[PDB]
Symmetry: C2
Subunit: 262 residues, 2 copies
């Protein structure tokens, strides 16, 4: 539990430093807080575990299958931060020899840390989260940014799933949206593009409550590269993938290759 405990305190303490920076200043603050927060997180890890690797948003050619890897987003939801001064998270996923060990998403402005060690359950603070139950799409609320319904091809494909869902939401922080699936606040969430540091922490929490995650082609998520994202309770993950994205697989493959190849 040692490294887990170190991560937990570190992320909370980095949250306190984010609020201190916001106080002093009472689109340039967010860049500055983003760098401050990653340099603190990087330096504290390096001081204590000198051989650990850090895959970070702020930039810190890394083979994520070898040794211990911290994948960090200092501020996930930067626009939320700039415009609302809340609804943004620090996110930390920790992986050992390519394999998930622990995940953390810290809602800095509510002081709520979501966290999970692989195998040991998922938590909101000191309260355990319950396993997820299956839903049908017809009774589910889903997370999806309205901007994706405007895009060529992607638009038409996401329209049907929006149409069948009961309703749709979008909160602007991917790590917090994936946690909203883990807590049952959304039955599913999707986006065509996310960096590893936006899903790594959230994914560990999701998996402890029996949720599932894939990309839009049903392929597993890994921290080796950016990807599209579909997460949900088992049941309706399989309905969205099987009945709504499957009939459009070739078009999704083409989008995927255009976005990610090379």
């Amino acid at each position: 539990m040692a490294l887990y405990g170190f991560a937990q305190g570190l992320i909370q303490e980095a949250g306190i430093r984010i609020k201190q920076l916001m106080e002093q200043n009472l689109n340039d603050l967010v860049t500055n807080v983003d760098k401050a927060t990653e340099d603190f997180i990087f330096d504290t890890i390096l001081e204590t575990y000198p051989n650990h690797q850090v895959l970070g948003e702020e930039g810190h050619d890394i083979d994520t299958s070898k040794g211990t890897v911290w994948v960090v987003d200092p501020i996930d939801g930067t626009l939320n931060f700039v415009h609302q001064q809340e609804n943004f998270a620090i996110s930390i996923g920790i992986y050992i020899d390519g394999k998930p060990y622990a995940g953390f998403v810290y809602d800095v402005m509510a002081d709520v840390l979501y966290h999970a060690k692989v195998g040991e359950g998922a938590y909101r603070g000191s309260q355990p989260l319950k396993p997820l139950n299956d839903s049908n799409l017809r009774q589910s609320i889903i997370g999806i940014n309205p901007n994706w319904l405007t895009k060529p091809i992607l638009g038409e494909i996401f329209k049907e799933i929006v149409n069948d869902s009961r309703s749709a939401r979008a909160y602007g922080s991917a790590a917090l949206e994936i946690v909203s699936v883990a807590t049952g606040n959304l039955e599913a969430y999707m986006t065509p593009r996310l960096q590893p540091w936006d899903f790594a922490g959230g994914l560990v929490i999701l998996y402890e409550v029996n949720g599932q995650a894939s990309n839009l082609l049903g392929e597993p998520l890994t921290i080796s590269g950016p990807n599209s994202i579909l997460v949900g309770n088992r049941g309706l993950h399989q309905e969205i993938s099987n009945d709504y994205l499957e009939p459009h697989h070739d078009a999704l493959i083409q989008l995927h290759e255009q976005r990610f190849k090379r």
Copy 2:
């Protein structure tokens, strides 16, 4: 005093919803909505016999909302959020005198935050005053709009271009709290093609008191006489969205509106 009375009243309504959720441990939302509206209605009339109540649960259907003092109330704004999230829903109460705003109240029940305003006297988050809004450019603005409206044949095109130019979009699923979100600065604009009076009435007073503006999609003023489309924002991007993006589609909107 009428203002203070409504403040105490909306909070007690919330305590009772919290009680019915607590005791229950999708028929819940239906019964809860009824008991809250009946509580609100019985408490208004018992102190103010001569007032009326235009209610989501069905009190005052077709009353003529221009005569006298009129309480326009939604007990659970965001019924889907209530069912699925047990949070992100609000009680909304607008008080209108002679067809004109007097006061507004939206109570985020699970966060225990009351947003309130009396015409001419400022808007509040509990006891903290809310700052007046500044102008934003559309390209630097976050807008609130549900993805669903982008699926519809004529609407989807009418909103497309405004989603594209805007910096990003969000959707919370409670119109009363989305309007309040425009009044607090968490959103720069919010829009939808259909909303009942009980879902905007309380929110509009809060907004007007921080200098935001509100109209329908055709730039016409909103009233409590019936359903309408909605566009709220700070002044500059209200004007940017209406003038520049909505105005070209007036004839299609005129048609949708009837």
